[PDB]
Amino acid sequence: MFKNLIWLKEVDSTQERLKEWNVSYGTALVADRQTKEGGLYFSFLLNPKEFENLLQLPLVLGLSVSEALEEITEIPFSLKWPNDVYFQEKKVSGVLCELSKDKLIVGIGINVNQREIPEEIKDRATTLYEITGKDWDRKEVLLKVLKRISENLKKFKEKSFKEFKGKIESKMLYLGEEVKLLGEGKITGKLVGLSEKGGALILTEEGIKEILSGEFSLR
């Protein structure tokens, strides 16, 4: 579980600082805002040897965020393969797992109370305030999310991805829908689910194709 919080009013980047400072496992570096109001950003370390599959990890983390956000707001969220949390077609939280030398640094951002969503992103991004019309205590949101991550990572470590695969698939945006791999005009088809290793499975004209990276969008 997370036993210590280092809360910053402002900082350049939580991911970056965890690359630079030696924080202990169980510590979440939180920031009210990152300098390259209402958002929630935090990072923490994981044992790189406990999670060697960084396709499955972001999905389990995304799942954890979606579960915590629904418990707090009562609103159901989707997961966009391979690492973001969405409400319908708009992103509410982003998950990033970075391998840096000796560390596995997890970074998560959640749009909680921001009031002004630019016009350029209004169609692809949202916030809990926008979705619910209410402000939420960011620390309570953080604690709930951290507790969910703790529980799922523990079960993930003790069992396997098979404990989350089905749940993740049921929340995947575009599941069953026709999609294309952004930038790769060749790969197009129905997104049917995930491979055992966490890869996205597309049923193309010439059978199933397992995708291990990239970004999907509806056709």
Add this chain to the structure above:
Amino acid sequence: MFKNLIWLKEVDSTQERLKEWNVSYGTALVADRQTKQEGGLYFSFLLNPKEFENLLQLPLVLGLSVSEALEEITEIPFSLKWPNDVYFQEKKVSGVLCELSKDKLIVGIGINVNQREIPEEIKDRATTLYEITGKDWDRKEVLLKVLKRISENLKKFKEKSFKEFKGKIESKMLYLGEEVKLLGEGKITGKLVGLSEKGGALILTEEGIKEILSGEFSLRRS
């Protein structure tokens, strides 16, 4: 000189944070409060130990810098109590500390901005900008202005010398021309007549002038 800001809500001490977490020059580590209540402004930053080897002149230049910034913000004049504090009349408003940790020179500054509760235990020696001006100031504005003054003064201090500040620092010195006592590693008593070129306090004692060059002494009115 300062662009990157790391602002924590609470820390043990900004000094300690900079001892543990590596930071680059130009970065200020700020905290709303230090554990060892609200309204104060505390921050630390690193300086190159090679360009500021006189840790008596340095605190006086930093104190002057803080003094100038607060005066430009509040339009109120502040005095400097040799060798590292900023005062308004007989009460402290800001303190400066310079520490040599390993191969680093960690500078720590504290400013009483909007604190509301001043214990009777120290109301005679401590005050806040709020109590003085009766208003409440944007601490980030205060910070930015102070970091700017410090940046400008250190550039010049490093380019030229203490002679550029000596006179200005002496004219703001608390107790100048009054009977004082220095305590800490011994006791020196007499009239504070000025400041030396080395940044030492000039005391007229029964044995004539004594130039205090140690920063381990506390200067207080007699």
